[model samples]
Target: PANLWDYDFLQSLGRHSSVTEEHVGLAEKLKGEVKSLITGPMEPLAKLEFIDSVRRLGLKYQFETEMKEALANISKDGYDSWWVDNLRATALRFRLLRENGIFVPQDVFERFQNKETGKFKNELCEDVKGLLNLYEASFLGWEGEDILDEARTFSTAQLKNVEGKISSPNLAKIVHHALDLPLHWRAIRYEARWFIDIYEDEEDMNPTLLKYAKLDFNIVQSFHQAEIGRLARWWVGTGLDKLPFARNGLIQSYMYAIGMLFEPHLGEVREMEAKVGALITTIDDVYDVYGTMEELELFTDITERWDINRVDQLPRNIRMPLLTMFNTSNDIGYWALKERGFNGIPYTAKVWADQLKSYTKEAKWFHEGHKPTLEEYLENALVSIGFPNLLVTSYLLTVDNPTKEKLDYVDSLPLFVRASCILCRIINDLGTLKSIQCYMNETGASQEVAREHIEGLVRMWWKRLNKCLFEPSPFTEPFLSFTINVVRGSHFFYQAESWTKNQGMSVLIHPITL
Candidate 1:
């Protein structure tokens, strides 16, 4: 039920101003001025404040090296420890340091805790700004960090009460938004979209920075619009959309793609993701909703061979579109093979085959009324959720350091990739007849208790993913960033029912509409 801002709608979303020159000039000017704020003779706290503002305002990409250098200098000087007494400043430092992979001890917040009472001070609860920063910082907590767990609970309790007690609409809005979804759990563009508007209203808002953000948003949106138009036509032309049983998921795919990488220059990778996502969803329906065990077996066999000889064995409904998947994979593989000078088709094909086998396993389990144990289910469910295939194929998209050796590491499903899958799987299980129900049956927990149990699992996995994100990885930053973004995308889409049906088109058009 998407009133898809189809072709004509996007066409009329209209052309952007020829603002490239203006944007370049403004961005350069802001970059120079912002670099000065960090590099000049400013107070240590002032320097941190400037870096934090640039990061929150979505300008960190323009000043990456400068920000890293500043943090290094601050870490070496070790001046923040003694002087940072305020709750807001302490939490802010804790987040910045951890965010840069430098651990500021959990005891950083102990001073705010009442040692005798084992609770935060009653007066500290009233510091809304401080609590909000503390709340955001708590998300970076590692396993067994009791203080962060306590801080999260205290901040959540305090924030829920602050809205009615406080008078400023903007401040209240921010607190509620943070409560709704922690910053670490949100997609970058969506958060940037929300923050840009709120930052505009701040008393300390810089006109120059605001202008640059607006221009950046507009320019990036134009790139997305153009990419959307191309993929929109390609999706419709697939003729797969015409199949009544299969989900028409091009819109949803675009939404997932935007969340993964919405930078202006990534249109090609986004296009590839859109095709892969659409195919994944459509084929998922074939197993989940339409095809029978016999039919699934045949399709599974075809994927195993992924050969032309097996095509004739399938029913036309399943056969034709699957052929498209094969063709698209080759097309992508062809490019990757040519660019990287290796035959990567086998690596590409193997991941897809593994996924189909996983899907077919679930289909058989469902048919036999088999309920699996948590370990047994997650083993298959991880591959069935489709990140393995997506993650493997994505290695081709990043031409930098895209060696066969690196692809081997990616093929092995590193901890980061599995963490992303678990994030997707748990969020997905919450709203469906998923593996959690098996846990419920096994433990005799009611639906409510079962949900809380699964939610707890999500938290643990997020902690695992947090470590994966900040820790050194064998992959490049771009690859690591993509893996994390996939998890963030799953969280954003699955917060409510039926991610594709409810949010498919809206999520796609949201960033551009901004």
Candidate 2:
């Protein structure tokens, strides 16, 4: 079937004609006010709530310095004295601190638990707001934090039962939304767009913050549209449409880019990522759906050679994607060389080679009808999930000054990268053949048992990823943020296949009303 979006339609939508300098000027003015509010005086709980609101409203980037300073002060002064016995405040503080890379022990919630029974008190269920915050905070837990695991189970059941018991309709809506997908797991831009609506309905919504959020979202979206326009031109130029067997995933690829890095300043990085995403989709189709085993080997070989001369050896159907990959890789390498004074081709080429080799192995398994053990499948599946390639490219492009040491660090596939790839692989294969089937086939478990086992793996990886965030690294914080966002984007895309279609339109095409 043909794609729902054609090049012409995308080109027309990409024209960000509605955006203006006036919007930019007003947004700047509003941003100053929001910054003041962040530095303004309020009770500890109220201050935390405001900070949380700013973040959820998608205005956090504007106040990074202020947010960090404020969080630092709060962390130093200690919330225990003020937020004593307040589950909502305690959980909120823990979540915000942990998210900022500040360590807050899980024992902070110990007070809320029934000391004798070793469970959260049953009466805490009536405190719906507290339960909601606990549920949100629980997602930030690392591995083997039994309290958080119990908190997750406790809060989930309590919130579900309090549908009619809660007086505030907005609170009820927020609880339902959290139950659907926790804030930590959601794509930042998508969550901001969503939370903006919910924030507007709040009784204490700040006019300055709301207006600023609306302006920022629309302005940023205008840039996003412009980026997507350029990407559309490039993708259309690739002529992958002639291949017929691959997915024409131009917008989907851009959505992944936007999800990973939504800041307008990262336009170049976003473009680079979207190109990689598009090529990965096209090449992935070649390996999985279209090519025979012999043809697959040839394609993999040509990718490893990383040369245009070998392109003619492949069948005509597979030639365009390889050629596009070659050109894009070289273009990226050139950019890194001229702009950053580093040779990126070797790093970029090696990742692509590794990715294709993994894909080829999977193809062989599929062709032979072999169900490898889950361990065997994931050892290859992590690379085949395509994050290592994306992360390596992003690191090369975005790093201020790329070094052999940092390059080697990223190339080594750091713990965070491996955890992210495993999380993504499991999430992508939730209902698919990759991990679940391999687990079931390897063990004698039924599908339900296999799914439970897979869910455990997901939690395990998330904990490792979460823990890795606080540790020192050669990569900068922004690069680490980008990596986490990649995992978050996978959750959004794989949540349901249709979300890519619907959410992409909302984010890239329709600008938020001012």
Candidate 3:
């Protein structure tokens, strides 16, 4: 009966606290800012610049000629083709960095100068050049070349179908089949100790990341004698097979890059994905053939482990992306798929409208500050998960009238509001620094880690909710204010905690691709 509140509500609650003043001020500012941002113009320009890169290709050649010779020798051994793997990783980084607006280095640009005279001004974006330099300078984990231009040049004339009737199905079939092994096999390797980069240099004598090292003739000498070809095949097979969902991001990443190399059309999309599938197959062989079985196995184990509860957190400047990736691997049927078995698809979570109705009534009881009953948690969990699951998947599977049914789906989706909190907590635990860093030195980010900031955010929203919930409303803004505070705060905290040495130093999220 009292749902229609007049101005007297605030008077009944009496004088506001400092937190109330600050939050009320912030909420108003946000209300205006959001409206302004959405109503404003979109960004003016967007496009790819340059690619098919190597970390410090020419510099590596210049400074470590002997290492280059050894690398070349190992490359040809055809087992765990270090050069090819390195190139794949580097190329993916090049594209990822480019897409993210991160800068590349200039020295790499100069490396691509006219051969007749080395002096050249790069015609590409300044940042792309900077990234290559960082790689050359050994500022990154990945090192190598982008093979798109090379692949393009090599296959330009051969792309033609001889006769319209002659289809490339065998080649396509080869590709689909080949995609299976590399990811799976490489997972076997990481499961087996090559945790750090083998090429890391010891003599650098600084904080510089040593991904490139010159080896003695003895190691290079023995490498030629090793059955590297087998290991190379195994590594590639990991990506190819999709076991443990292919821990190596390069081949998979490149599959996307190669697709990008010929962007803009539906036909090109299919063509490039096919081309990348083929490229991955080619590189997969090199890993299996040229690699030292012992070494590649070591790296493989680190990538495939599900020991999320360990310390040390996987190393990288970014952490929470692992949440996205790991959830993805877990959510879908990918790496966990055994040899000729069921895919990783979990049972479809059902979303019900009644779930949130129950959660809200329960949460309202709790937020005024009552502890939720176990029944409420169960009621909330099932529906929040189911509602979003159904809503999201429908978007993926549906091709038409998506939006019309979308909200109805969301509204009817049972566990959504409750599920949001449940999944958020579960994913955070699975991908947190405290839980899973033992697998790598990297860190992760999520909302649980950002309480200080999030509390501040909530306090701001609290002012708004205070008005809505107190006697003049005793209830809270169960939806918008509470969800934003919880979700954003938890995510921000997790992001902060999920650091590879770099993330801790830089302290930023990767702008969230998913």
Candidate 4:
């Protein structure tokens, strides 16, 4: 029941040097220079590569108008005739278009495959750049696109084989990194940091763009440090920090928020997101690790009631997190009403109630020595993963004018949300129970097969989530982007629990050298 992190240490985690006014001025000048480069004329493929570089450097936000106009022109061109023979350019074009919500069919890569074999040609593997691009682009494939699946398999095999054969050390490193995690699945902020170092060593790397990226990273890091500092104070203020049973993950919670939305302007939403994460982590421990069956039932009931008056019915250890949850929900609701002129209390309250109810079900099953079948566990596990509640709150917080239609869309748990939840739940359950064990228990399968089956589910969900991105949706781009980012954040955090703390310190506390 004890927390792994110390309260005093968490409070002291986020103090860092603030960004200077000089950095802001320099960033402004460099941003204009970079904007001109993106908007300026070059070969179409060169333009795409430049735009991709800007995005990878995390400066895409600064040149959105330029980047969009360029992509629109390229999209209008409908894949240049010259790109037919160029795998690198073709895959790059496809990935950028799809990522920006412009639809580029899987058929785009059809030409690269041998019709007789329905596989990528063996000769194509000789072009390592093309293979790397295809490998990265393959991750953007939607469900049912067999070619993309083949592209992933084909390119991955070729990439692994080329390890010792690659010429340039920089290219080799980039290839190794892409093989480890495709560019599509990476958390944007982290990817930017990783790529900036790699980009610096490239022969053609522009000095202006590199300088701007470093300046921008440091400036954004300054904002994150301040935001997390404020959140740390708020965590201490909530008195939930003193609760002996929960994980002291204030910094990690803030990391989740930053990973979801790292724009300098979204500090308020980020703060609320971090709070949701902290509460979720705390309450999840209450259900999974700390609470007795009877106490959990009472806690679930109290959460469903959404009343401070019911707090006394729970145990003292449970009381603080419950009260924190109650107050945080009301505060978020109030903030939504003031900002969006929409009362989100009912939706927010209902989502939490649903989540807690699901948590109670799992707790009950655990205490009863139950081994739920995979299907049965996931039915509850999806909601228990807590994205539905987090997304509902996030939708309200991020949307410009929250409407009942859009709110209902999110509440309905559309495929987009479901895919994200599935990834979060199954990816989380990989190392723990409720997924592998349940599958093994139900079918008497070996742990290896169960693990493979579960991992296969993760791949399936990613494709589904990718599909959702390209389809039409009632949700705005920002809202949908936030939802997708949660899936990316799950991959980042769930890779290893310990890595999260280290990553949080790097992204949230340590400023990139300018």
Question: Tens digits of per-residue lDDT for model 2 on 13-40?
Answer: 5454677889888988999899998998
RMSD of 2: 2.1
Candidate 3, which segments miss by more than 4 Å at Cα?
A: 1-79, 83-360, 363-378, 381-400, 403-421, 425-490, 493-514
Candidate maximizing TM-score: 2
Would you list the rank order by TM-score, best first? 2, 4, 1, 3
Q: Which ten residues in a row have the lowest lDDT in candidate 2?
A: 1-10
Candidate 1 wrong stretches, greater than 4 Å: 1-20, 38-49, 81-83, 245-248, 399-403, 496-514
Scored by CA lDDT, what does every candidate get?
A: 0.75, 0.84, 0.28, 0.82
- When summed lDDT is taken over every stretch of 10 residues in candidate 4, the lowest stretch is 1-10
Tens digits of per-residue lDDT for model 4, 1-514: 1122555544554464656888889889998998888888888888888899999988777788899998898889654776777899889988999888788888988888898899899898778989999999888888889999999999999999997799999999999988877888778898888889999999779999999999999888877766766787799898777776555567667777777889988889889988988898888887766546577777777777876675687778788888888888989989999988998887888888999988888877877898898989998889999888888888988787788887887888888887888788997787455799899999999999999899889888898888777667777767887888887777766666566656665665567776
Provide the TM-score for each candidate, comma-separated: 0.91, 0.96, 0.18, 0.93
Per-residue accuracy of model 1 over 1-514 as CA lDDT, tens digit each: 1255344453333244344576667767866776777666767756676677667665666678888888878777845554367898788778888888788888988988899876888898789989998999998898888899899999999999876787878888889888878888887766676788888887667666666676666666667767767776676676777775444477677788777887766678778877888788888887775545577777777777867676787778788678878888887787777776766677768888998889878877887889888778888898988888877777777747567787888788878788888778877777453767878878888888878889888888888887776677777776777888888788777763354544443333444232
For each of the candidates, give the backbone clash count.
0, 0, 125, 0
The positional error of residue 200 in candidate 2, measured at the CA in angstroms, is 0.2
Worst 10 residues of 3 by lDDT: 44-53
Off by over 4 Å in 4: 1-18, 496-498
lDDT score for residue 199 of model 2:
95
